[PDB]
Amino acid sequence: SLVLDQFGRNLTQAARESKLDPVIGREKEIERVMQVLSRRTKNNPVLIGEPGVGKTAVVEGLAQAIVKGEVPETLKDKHLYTLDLGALVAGSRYRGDFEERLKKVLKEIRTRGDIILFIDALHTLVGAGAAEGAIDAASILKPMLARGELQTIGATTLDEYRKHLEKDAALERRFQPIQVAEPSLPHTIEILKGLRDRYEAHHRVSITDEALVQAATLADRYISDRFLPDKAIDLIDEAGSRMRIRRGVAEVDGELIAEVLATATGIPVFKLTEEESSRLLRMEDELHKRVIGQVDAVKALSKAIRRTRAGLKDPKRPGGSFIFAGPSGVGKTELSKALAEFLFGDEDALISLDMSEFSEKHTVSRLFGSPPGYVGYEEGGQLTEKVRRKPFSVVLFDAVEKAHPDIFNSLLQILEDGRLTDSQGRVVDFKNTVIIMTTNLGTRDISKGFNLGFAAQGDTKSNYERMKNKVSDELKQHFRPEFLNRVDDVVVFPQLSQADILKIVDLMIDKVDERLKDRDMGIELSSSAKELLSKKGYDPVLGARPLRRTIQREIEDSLSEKILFGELRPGHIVVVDTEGEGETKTFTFRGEE
Amino acid sequence: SLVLDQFGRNLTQAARESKLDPVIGREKEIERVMQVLSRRTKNNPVLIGEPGVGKTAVVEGLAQAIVKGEVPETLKDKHLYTLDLGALVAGSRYRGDFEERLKKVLKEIRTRGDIILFIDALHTLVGAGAAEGAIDAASILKPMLARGELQTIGATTLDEYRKHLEKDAALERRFQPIQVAEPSLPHTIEILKGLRDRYEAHHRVSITDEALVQAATLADRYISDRFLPDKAIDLIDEAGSRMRIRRVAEVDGELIAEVLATATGIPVFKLTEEESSRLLRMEDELHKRVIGQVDAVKALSKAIRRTRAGLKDPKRPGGSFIFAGPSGVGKTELSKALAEFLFGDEDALISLDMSEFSEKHTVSRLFGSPPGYVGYEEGGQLTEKVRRKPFSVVLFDAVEKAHPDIFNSLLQILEDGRLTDSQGRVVDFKNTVIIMTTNLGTRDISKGFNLGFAAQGDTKSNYERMKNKVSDELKQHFRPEFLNRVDDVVVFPQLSQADILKIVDLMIDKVDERLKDRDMGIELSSSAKELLSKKGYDPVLGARPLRRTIQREIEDSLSEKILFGELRPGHIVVVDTEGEGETKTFTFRGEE
């Protein structure tokens, strides 16, 4: 076994002292392993599973069973060697030397006879035909496997196995797949409890069950790039290392696990703990902080989302469905961005789609995709692709009233069944998404008093009272009552206020100041300048959106030339004062030390 | 230990003898790696970064912390050595001779039990089997690596690590990645303050703190191929060497700037009074070539001054501009003038055509070959070109004819200036000028005189209405999360009359250069220029037909006269108009 020792590791004597692992809850797969191994022919098991799943745990459990336990005939005292293809290429200046030692080791097995082999992730000795320079030593074992002289067990991943191993007929014929899936939360709890003994033996730690539960929950929630039964081990080992490095027996709690996860990635503690009810209450000010002034809108949205987050509804419909009725330049997009930022921590967690160009018939195809064999099949629909990229996001529908009704049908199954099927055949889930439909229906009379012809002065307070009823009736008459029944809430955006414009301009000015402080520049605005920018930068058919260009045209353009001229030196504060009256008012800059 | 000394080096004794550079501002990295090594599983830490950032520096910091005694138990105080692969490979004529030495070394290090090994470029030790003639000696280390009786620390880059260590699962269960990052400006300044004593002693020179900070800043902002701790130290060494080779020697800001000016060429100047002064009248310089569009160049100048004075956000590049004019009226020439003005030459505007970047897989080769792609060497072109010439202009022609997903990459271009291509290594676009030229801004205006008798005309609302049309068309045709993240959309209308005369002057100057190549010259009267302007004016076709008109009416006659022999070297041709009305013709007189 010298060649085996050079390019592999034996398992039977290692498990004879049993210094590998205590197997937890993997009896059925191991029994199936013996079942497949006992076959006269086709006795080449392969375990398909993700890297997080403990497929090697099954193999070492088999080794432990062979060492001690119930083992049927033709399987007792079978020496099991794991082979690493990354080591077999040792000293391979040219390709032939690889196969020479390959034949030497295989004749070593044939002389040995009582050998069971375990392979690595596979599809590197047989799937090497798609690479340049890699060793394609595939048919090396085919005659010996066909003659039944050698028995081996492999392991792969399901998708890659289907995309390589299902191609060649000989490989798929002489290999029996065995499915290993991700263990659930309780199973990981018993696994952690079983490994806690060895972890406390190695790391001088005292581990509590609540700490293990918190570790598993945090690993499942805040980590998704890895699979379940490894990240808990990583967290507990890192916590043990961090406590031992700090070190007249110490203990670990859930606080240490949360701190470890935060240090790995994420904000320190806080959100990693359980504060949901208090998390919702502090949300109210946060929304009223991001958008300056909605009162009823934010209140209704908050009440709806607090209601829906208290778990009562089954996971068959999305978290929330809202219809934002209001004119442009009010802040519906800003409110949606703020809600997404609070709920998921990312600004880009919003998916914005405009329905003004979805009016005709066939355009709706690009919202789903195309049938196979036609243009635009490689890329799916915008909605389906963007949703399947980010399962936790907020869907936004701009100008819904202009969209063609057919998509509403799919919207129906979005709002009732909570899932959709794309043209590629996959399934996209909308359970964790919140759907918002922005609309401007009924705001034309509110925004513009004159509609077409001879109008009187009228009033402006009745709409201020019954805007919600007006928009509800307008949506009921314009659209199908069933769809309005499916949707959950309606939120109406009233007109802006001058003081709100003052807060907006204050935010823009101090955003400028916090970055211009690098040169130690202070910016001061007079109240006259505030009102002048408010009047110039506001427009009823545009709202507060022209302000971003207005201040840039007014302040930044003059500031740039004033700085570049040299009249202003680092370490000064500029105060803005308006010179003139009415349209002749001009912003002027006064420098102070 | 003869085996260690013959084929490896000692850092603990060297740290005890104090023969290496001091370590400053790397406490977090060393704490992280030394707590990683204490893990029960995956206890073999591997450092992932780029060369010259301080991998050896943090390793020496670990060795120093070990030798000084400010370390805890659980390896307490022991020996950390490094393996020199050059000594191992040398003296091994055959593979059997090579492997028998490695196994002996590993057996000794395992038997002593108080030795921790360090290697550099770990990718070679584990991934040499994909190429012929390279020894992949991982089998020497793999068994006892998996057995947990051998501990090693590795240094590797992110490309090699991603392509070698993430692929194999077996080692991925044993190596823990730790990221090491390039230090900030204060940390680099502290490193230079640490190394100044040694470099002054060796070079017999003196260096000022102002020189240190200026060198760090210029290395940060004017060099992209290298890294801050890797480039500033080398540039300081080169400046000291120049000062010593010139002849107490002292170096100032002028020397520490001129050394880079000589090294990288293209003597771009620092923030100077002349540089700011020329920007206040640069519109006139841009009008020396571009004629007939003052509002567009004024907007461009406003944007450039805003982003140059230090008023625009640092998150954006030097500028993002969308040109959506018709054909043959602007663009291209404007970009050339801007490049010549800004980056002191015409070699800028590396330029790309988007129309051939239409298929999805084409988008692949513009930004790096994916793993498994046949011919992996076929990486990105834009990334490499920008990397090699960071101070150039990027100009994409016909952005309409392009695959949509390429426009995704542009989001990382403007939002961050960072592309971090997989095998393209560092892709930093820093402060560059990005110009997207498209032909979707073409409407019917000159023909448009409205249905009706009418009697009126306005030339003011043109820019605002064209801006509205172009903005609406772009918003309808394309997503807004990229349209909002752009500096400006510079749109200009068709060239107007009374601008043709300057264009005629420029083209006549070019023709005059062509004649002067053969020792000749050309000059025209105002009547000839106005006749050419009248004959070659096309409202919608732009200034292109003017060149054809000159070609038909001017140098065809010149060519036939030269061939006939009437015109000879050392002559000047005078062009006049003869006749009246539409019957005016050109007359050529050759004089000495």
Ligand SMILES: Nc1ncnc2c1ncn2[C@@H]1O[C@H](COP(=O)(O)OP(=O)(O)OP(=O)(O)O)[C@@H](O)[C@H]1O
């Ligand atoms: N109430 C508000 N709170 C914060 N910002 C606002 C508000 N109203 C307008 N803005 C500003 O206006 C710009 C975007 O316009 P806004 O958020 O009003 O659009 P919207 O009304 O949601 O859009 P739509 O035109 O689709 O109705 C941003 O600069 C944003 O800061």
Ligand SMILES: Nc1ncnc2c1ncn2[C@@H]1O[C@H](COP(=O)(O)OP(=O)(O)OP(=O)(O)O)[C@@H](O)[C@H]1O
């Ligand atoms: N305003 C101008 N000033 C100077 N030259 C001009 C001007 N307008 C057009 N030209 C000349 O017209 C020719 C074509 O100009 P240019 O290459 O800039 O056009 P373009 O609009 O970018 O091209 P395309 O036809 O691909 O849209 C050049 O010879 C250029 O010098």
Ligand SMILES: Nc1ncnc2c1ncn2[C@@H]1O[C@H](COP(=O)(O)OP(=O)(O)O)[C@@H](O)[C@H]1O
């Ligand atoms: N049923 C189980 N009982 C005990 N430990 C387990 C079990 N399943 C997984 N593990 C542990 O999870 C860890 C990671 O699984 P591993 O076998 O490395 O997966 P893979 O083989 O895909 O890399 C192993 O070290 C193992 O100890």
Ligand SMILES: Nc1ncnc2c1ncn2[C@@H]1O[C@H](COP(=O)(O)OP(=O)(O)O)[C@@H](O)[C@H]1O
């Ligand atoms: N953070 C740092 N602390 C101490 N020295 C540093 C640091 N960063 C860079 N250096 C110095 O830069 C020089 C080159 O760095 P180098 O060791 O080649 O980096 P790497 O190990 O990443 O290749 C070294 O001599 C080192 O002294």
Ligand SMILES: [Mg+2]
């Ligand atoms: Mg052009």
